[PDB]
Design a protein around this ligand. Structure first.
Ligand SMILES: Nc1nc2c(ncn2[C@@H]2O[C@H](COP(=O)(O)OP(=O)(O)NP(=O)(O)O)[C@@H](O)[C@H]2O)c(=O)[nH]1
Ligand SMILES: [Cl-]
Ligand SMILES: [Mg+2]
Lengths: 170, 166
């Protein structure tokens, strides 16, 4: 078989949205921060034995531009909601992303995965249990990642595809 | 002007001269912000814009530059320190040629700036407007053509020389 999924990566500035995406697409990590305006990538993968094309939209953490961001959200099938484990504000921002996705998609059941990135760093401020509890309250998976070491990168994106497939079964 | 300084940038494309853009700096209404840009344009504090890049050019919107410390779009430094407060919002982003400060939220002005190529009214009250292109809007329009939807440029656009006129 083949299928195709539109994935959208969202979250506050600097949390690692691009680093995670670039690890998935290009298999490398760099310390330099290159702020995003918008980038799009395509990759063919096999998940649970089923081949698919991933169309990944890497969005900016910028907070304005509601009309453009609503357009991202209407077209996206699933959302990686990323925060950094050493940035409490980025974790506190997550609920805003979830609220906006639910409003734009007019549903309380939207495929999404909570991603806690930068787990390689020694400066944690958000503990695993707070993030697990938040994900449980949303009914969505939580995946800890490091774009630097590649820990959890495939898992985050593949889990989101699994969430989309489960949603389509309903 | 009898009050507002004029500064210039000689713009280069992969090192080749494209042309000169001059700016009126509205020291009359935005003195601290105008003075920062003036001094960074002359280099008189020992650092400034000469050699730096227009790292983000988005056709229909703006040409952004001014990172002479990290050279990658993340840096910035004013003559007052790493950052300074939003001085005022007297002037608005009314159309092409407006010169305004880039920032990372309230009170984070450094050295990065942008030149509007269209009205950008959603930036009013968030970015401090402090000058306007005097001569060389045609050069800004030529620069805009090296940009792309995500701002990456197809050739390296730099401030090959800069300074103050008269
Ligand atoms: N140690 C470590 N650094 C990381 C990790 N992920 C990203 N970074 C670093 O954090 C910075 C910002 O990463 P980036 O992916 O650009 O963040 P973003 O969420 O895309 N930012 P924007 O919203 O502005 O596009 C970069 O310096 C990058 O190297 C990670 O897992 N570990
Ligand atoms: Cl908008
Ligand atoms: Mg990014």
């Amino acid at each position: 078989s083949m299928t195709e999924y539109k994935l959208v990566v969202v979250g506050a500035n600097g949390v690692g949205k691009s680093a995670l995406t670039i690890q998935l697409i290009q298999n490398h990590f760099v310390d330099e921060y290159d702020p995003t305006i918008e980038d799009s990538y395509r990759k063919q993968v096999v998940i649970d034995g089923e081949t698919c094309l991933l169309d990944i939209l890497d969005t900016a953490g910028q907070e304005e531009y509601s009309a453009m961001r609503d357009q991202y959200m209407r077209t996206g099938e699933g959302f990686l909601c990323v925060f950094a484990i050493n940035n409490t504000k980025s974790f506190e921002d997550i609920h805003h992303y979830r609220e906006q996705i639910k409003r734009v998609k007019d549903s309380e059941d939207v495929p999404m995965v909570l991603v806690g990135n930068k787990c390689d760093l020694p400066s944690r401020t958000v503990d695993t249990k707070q993030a697990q509890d938040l994900a449980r309250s949303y009914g969505i998976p939580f995946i800890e990642t490091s774009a630097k070491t590649r820990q959890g990168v495939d898992d985050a994106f593949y889990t989101l595809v699994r969430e989309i497939r489960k949603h389509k079964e309903k | 002007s009898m009050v507002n300084p004029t500064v210039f940038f000689d713009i280069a494309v992969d090192g080749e001269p494209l042309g000169r853009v001059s700016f009126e700096l509205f020291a009359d209404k935005v003195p601290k912000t105008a003075e920062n840009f003036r001094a960074l344009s002359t280099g008189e504090k020992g650092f400034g814009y000469k050699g730096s890049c227009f790292h983000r050019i988005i056709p229909g919107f703006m040409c952004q530059g001014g990172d002479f410390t990290r050279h990658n779009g993340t840096g910035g430094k004013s003559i007052y320190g790493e950052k300074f407060e939003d001085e005022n919002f007297i002037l608005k982003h009314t159309g092409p040629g407006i010169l305004s400060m880039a920032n990372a939220g309230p009170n984070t002005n450094g050295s990065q700036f942008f030149i509007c190529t269209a009205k950008t009214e959603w930036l009013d009250g968030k970015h401090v407007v402090f000058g306007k292109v005097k001569e060389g809007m045609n050069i800004v329009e030529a620069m805009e053509r090296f940009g792309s939807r995500n701002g990456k440029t197809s050739k390296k656009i730099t401030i090959a020389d800069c300074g103050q006129l008269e």
